[PDB]
Design a protein around this ligand. Structure first.
Ligand SMILES: *[C@@H]1O[C@H](CO)[C@@H](O[C@@H]2O[C@H](CO)[C@@H](O)[C@H](O)[C@H]2NC(C)=O)[C@H](O)[C@H]1NC(C)=O
Ligand SMILES: *[C@@H]1O[C@H](CO)[C@@H](O[C@@H]2O[C@H](CO)[C@@H](O)[C@H](O)[C@H]2NC(C)=O)[C@H](O)[C@H]1NC(C)=O
Ligand SMILES: *[C@@H]1O[C@H](CO)[C@@H](O[C@@H]2O[C@H](CO)[C@@H](O)[C@H](O)[C@H]2NC(C)=O)[C@H](O)[C@H]1NC(C)=O
Ligand SMILES: *[C@@H]1O[C@H](CO)[C@@H](O)[C@H](O)[C@H]1NC(C)=O
Ligand SMILES: *[C@@H]1O[C@H](CO)[C@@H](O)[C@H](O)[C@H]1NC(C)=O
Ligand SMILES: *[C@@H]1O[C@H](CO)[C@@H](O)[C@H](O)[C@H]1NC(C)=O
Ligand SMILES: [Cu+2]
Ligand SMILES: [Cu+2]
Ligand SMILES: [Cu+2]
Ligand SMILES: [Cu+2]
Length: 499
């Protein structure tokens, strides 16, 4: 682990996590990217050094620290052309921010086009010295972080615009493909009688995974960085970018158990040990498990999750009972996704720079039709109805700069204005279920923040909008460092081949 002060050297290198060699993007020489850690209250100083040389996976880069509110540091959020111009090859840029009021399981990834799928993605854990759940487990460290990665044998910009599934599922950076049946499997070691806090992170570019561990039940205690009341489950369907912490009591008979992560599409199932990993108790023989998968009888259901501390829902307990309600109508035309008739295309001047340059209204901000000003200190309700006009469902939507209350979850017709879970990535479900996912949050964080589908190939095809929150306080709330002001002039001088 590295952090909270560290340098991240981004570069290209050939990797073979599933035994197939391909050029990719590594950070500090490895893939997935290294685990970054800190404690609640720390100042994070992450120096990103861009030494990328391959234009096909892009030589420029930008990094987003997924889940952090970035209050006062909107310039360090990461989205290229929203919060900064990309960092150029041969240059570095220091992301400097604090995390005073958050703790839990997060992750970081490139936020420039589809570059994170090419390798720039890794876990990020912020420990809480006074964790309210600390008495529930014995072990919580770098060896208890589990990443789920969708891996492609063809580079993101060389493949189809909407890939039909990954070549392999990697658990802790290792897995088998259906062309590499003998590659090494990841092994997670546990000691009989100990309790482990496993921090499950989906760093997926697309598929959702149905996760389970043979012969063991799991106690969920954290959801996208938010502590939850303990919930016993035997399987977890986790969408791209979501995170869960669960307690595993290693009290079963010493042996080898399969860890399973089945994708929703692509090569499903476990033939040959694909989409799997190994849970090995100390004392067990070095061998592949022979355990069988049991039907899930207590699967995780989002409406059964509730925050550990009271988190009141903003607004009145009635539909549209808020200061500003917005319905997002999705559409797709064969190549691009649209929200309310607008497909997001990155502007030449980052939205935050537009705002600092004098742009204050919707018709002043670019791109036109995709930027929505939100009033300060108000309650907001957003509905994201599933629809057949937007293929590739269920679409996991994510909001930058905030955590939100999930008033109505996918697969449920009820509204919970009392104690719903708060989180930062939510599945919007499917039109067959008649879903109308409803979320609420308050505007307490001035700046332009992205709201988009976390399937990266869909974001690239325009499935996003920008909220320009409290436009009048943006400049004063977010003083920018000189190094950030230099990024656009540097990037704009690049020829297309060096981008
Ligand atoms: C730059 O990166 C790209 C993408 O990873 C590499 O693309 C490979 O190109 C070869 C030859 O055209 C193909 O056979 C491979 O299938 C491509 N790989 C992938 C992962 O798609 C390219 O080789 C890299 N360039 C250099 C000089 O290393
Ligand atoms: C995982 O938890 C489930 C809870 O539903 C356990 O299943 C129940 O186990 C008790 C055994 O005392 C039975 O009486 C119930 O009928 C079970 N039934 C089902 C399918 O609901 C399961 O045993 C737990 N597994 C482990 C490995 O602890
Ligand atoms: C999803 O829920 C939203 C919010 O309740 C629905 O939009 C509201 O629909 C009613 C019409 O019956 C109007 O009174 C509101 O003005 C609508 N819009 C907004 C912005 O609030 C939306 O129709 C629901 N969609 C589906 C498919 O059920
Ligand atoms: C394992 O511990 C769990 C609690 O996490 C409990 O349900 C059960 O009593 C234990 N089973 C064994 C094999 O001891
Ligand atoms: C989809 O709309 C985008 C954005 O306007 C446009 O560039 C593209 O031509 C459209 N695609 C089709 C297949 O019509
Ligand atoms: C999108 O444009 C169509 C065609 O004019 C219009 O009928 C519809 O109201 C628009 N959708 C939204 C949500 O604005
Ligand atoms: Cu993200
Ligand atoms: Cu984010
Ligand atoms: Cu999507
Ligand atoms: Cu994002």
């Amino acid at each position: 682990a590295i952090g909270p002060a560290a340098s991240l050297v981004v570069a290209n290198a050939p990797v073979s996590p599933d035994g197939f060699l391909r050029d990719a993007i590594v950070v500090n020489g490895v893939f997935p990217s290294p685990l970054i850690t800190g404690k609640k209250g720390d100042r994070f100083q992450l120096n990103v050094v861009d030494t990328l040389t391959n234009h096909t996976m892009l030589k420029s880069t930008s990094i987003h620290w997924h889940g952090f509110f970035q209050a006062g540091t909107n310039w360090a959020d990461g989205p290229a052309f929203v919060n900064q111009c990309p960092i150029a090859s041969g240059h570095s840029f220091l992301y400097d921010f604090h995390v005073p009021d958050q703790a839990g399981t997060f992750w970081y990834h490139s936020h420039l086009s589809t570059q994170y799928c090419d390798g720039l993605r890794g876990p990020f854990v912020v420990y809480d010295p006074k964790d309210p759940h600390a008495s529930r487990y014995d072990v919580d460290n770098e060896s208890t972080v589990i990443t789920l990665t969708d891996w492609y044998h063809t580079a993101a910009r060389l493949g189809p615009r909407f890939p039909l599934g990954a070549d392999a599922t990697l658990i802790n950076g290792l897995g088998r493909s259906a062309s590499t049946p003998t590659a090494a499997l990841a092994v997670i070691n546990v000691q009989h009688g100990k309790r482990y806090r496993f921090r499950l992170v989906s760093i997926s570019c697309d598929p959702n995974y149905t996760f389970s561990i043979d012969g063991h039940n799991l106690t969920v205690i954290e959801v996208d960085g938010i502590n939850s009341q303990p919930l016993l489950v035997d399987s977890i369907q986790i969408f791209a970018a979501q995170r869960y912490s669960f307690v595993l009591n290693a009290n079963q008979t010493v042996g080898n158990y399969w860890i399973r992560a089945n994708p929703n599409f692509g090569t499903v199932g476990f033939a040959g040990g694909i989409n799997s990993a190994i849970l090995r108790y100390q004392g067990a023989p070095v061998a592949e498990p022979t355990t069988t998968q049991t039907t899930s009888v207590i699967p995780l259901i989002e409406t059964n999750l509730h925050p550990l501390a009271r988190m009141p829902v903003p607004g009145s307990p009635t539909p549209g009972g808020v200061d500003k309600a917005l319905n997002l109508a999705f559409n797709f035309n064969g190549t691009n996704f649209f929200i309310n008739n607008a497909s997001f295309t990155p502007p030449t001047v980052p939205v935050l720079l537009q705002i600092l340059s004098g742009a204050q209204t919707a018709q002043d901000l670019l791109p036109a039709g995709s930027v929505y000003p939100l009033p300060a200190h108000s309650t907001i309700e957003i509905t994201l109805p599933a629809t057949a006009l937007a293929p590739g469902a269920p679409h996991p939507f994510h909001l930058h700069g905030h955590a939100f209350a999930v008033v109505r979850s996918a697969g449920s017709t009820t509204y919970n204005y009392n104690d719903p879970i708060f989180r930062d990535v939510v599945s919007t479900g499917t039109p067959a279920a008649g879903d109308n996912v409803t979320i609420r949050f308050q505007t307490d964080n001035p700046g332009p923040w992205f709201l988009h589908c976390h399937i990266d190939f869909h974001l690239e095809a325009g499935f996003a909008i920008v909220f320009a929150e409290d436009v009048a306080d943006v400049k004063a709330a977010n003083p920018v460092p000189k190094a950030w002001s230099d990024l656009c002039p540097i990037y704009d001088g690049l020829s297309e081949a060096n981008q």
